[PDB]
Symmetry: C2
Subunit: 261 residues, 2 copies
């Protein structure tokens, strides 16, 4: 019998953002963004009621090599704290084994963010020099991509990054963006193209995406392995895609939100 | 107990192509291309033996509105003639209901092919004029996209296309490409970006992709609903993606095959 779905998500612009007057608001009304709108459309199309909740540790999901314990939104699904994750959650082999993922609702690749005027055009450029530091988010698919890569240029990037001092790794996207902005061109941030493209068009308009994408992948809606929600959630994603709704929401939250001309 | 997998596919460059000396060859050796190489890697990674076979009717898959019968590669899976489809087979809602699809191994969008010098930059351009004819492949996801679209510009394109005389629809990609080349700029062909991008770089180098993509989707490996092959095939796709193998094969069959500079 039908009950209220607990949705795990993460504060990540423009996907889930606190409204500025959130202290004045209750429940799902506290939040706005692409994944908030998507949650509403999916809920509507699968006939369910839901509660948005921000993941407590503020992480996406990785497994600890010692304890084998999952953190982040992945751990919330794995250990039964949440029924579904609606977020910019990257589809990976390691995750697909422990949770179910819908077909992708958005595509992306790993990309490079620089302070405007930084003399770097590509990951090759980054790997061949030392003056400009570079790093990635902690507990995410981007860090794992570099850690497990056996491709020469990325292997070389990873060997640098893992022992660089001070740490090149950051805990949130906001913190990586802040570091690019405040490091006067001496730090480049490796992040997903979708996030990069949003920030590029936000004030103070001082960052830039450079070079091709390093890989090719997608975000999926994630459910615990074998949940009854998996099948209808997947069909809702395909239907919304085909109805043009996913493209409408991308325009709403990227193009319409552009503050840089 | 483990037996030889029947793989359904379609002749579509650069995915599956007859080797020029195919009369001299037997079995899987008759064929080359991206999907031939992918079939070999997936077979290797799931521990199975396989037989490549070209779909008899030469179609992708649509359901007849009268009889409700599926044709093409989709029908081969649905009616049990094949065990798996390894091809440029687009993930759609209607198909996902009757077959299982792996996560996407390649991304694409609907795009516009013109003879070089054709005064058309976009689907809006196409929809606002009459001198230049335009159409799509029969029995495919592109025709259905336009047929079912309620988006103004594509609705308008579809109303034209469905009653245009002579027919704007073609039976194979080769035939749509031939029509662009031989119609002196008076026909534009609507096809998937991946196919477009390949042809653009092939002699006689007289076509061109123009405008943004009309939509966003992917190709998946397809199995009959509930096949034991679904789960290991999906994990092989993610692993190959992550190992960089899918990117290596894209370069092999697109960039390395470029004859246009
Ligand atoms: C129904 C919404 N359609 C969006 C969509 C976008 N794609 C393609 C895509 O997002 N690309 C992905 S995602 C991804 C991979 C790849 C790839 N190699 O191209 C490899 C590893 C696993 C995750 N496909 C679709 C859709 F949903 F039709 F299938
Ligand atoms: N979307 C990523 C987080 C961002 C990143 O790693 O760059 C994940 O699911 O882990
Ligand atoms: N890949 C398409 C065929 C090509 C097209 O429709 O443009 C399909 O699966 O139907």
């Amino acid at each position: 019998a039908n009950k209220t779905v607990v949705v795990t998500t993460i504060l990540e612009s423009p996907y889930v953002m606190m409204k500025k007057n959130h202290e004045m608001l209750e429940g799902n009304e506290r939040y706005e963004g692409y994944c908030v709108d998507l949650a509403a459309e999916i809920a509507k199309h699968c006939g369910f009621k839901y509660k948005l909740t921000i993941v407590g540790d503020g992480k996406y999901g990785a497994r600890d090599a010692d304890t084998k314990i999952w953190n982040g939104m992945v751990g919330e699904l794995v250990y039964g704290k949440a029924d579904i994750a609606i977020a910019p959650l990257t589809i990976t082999l390691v995750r697909e084994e422990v949770i179910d993922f819908s077909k992708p609702f958005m595509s992306l690749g790993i990309s490079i963010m620089i302070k405007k005027g930084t003399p770097i055009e590509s990951a090759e450029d980054l790997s061949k020099q030392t003056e400009i530091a570079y790093g990635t988010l902690d507990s995410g698919s981007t860090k794992e991509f570099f850690r497990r890569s056996k491709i020469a240029v990325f292997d070389k990037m990873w060997t640098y990054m893992r022992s660089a001092e001070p740490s090149v790794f950051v805990r949130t996207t906001a913190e990586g963006v802040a570091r690019v902005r405040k490091s006067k061109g001496k730090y480049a941030y490796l992040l997903e193209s979708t996030m990069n493209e949003y920030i590029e068009q936000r004030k103070p308009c001082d960052t830039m995406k450079v070079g091709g994408n390093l890989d090719s992948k997608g975000y999926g809606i994630a459910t615990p392995k074998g949940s009854s929600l998996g099948t209808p959630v997947n069909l809702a994603v395909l239907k919304l895609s085909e109805q043009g709704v996913l493209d409408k929401l991308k325009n709403k939250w990227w193009y319409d939100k552009g503050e840089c001309g």
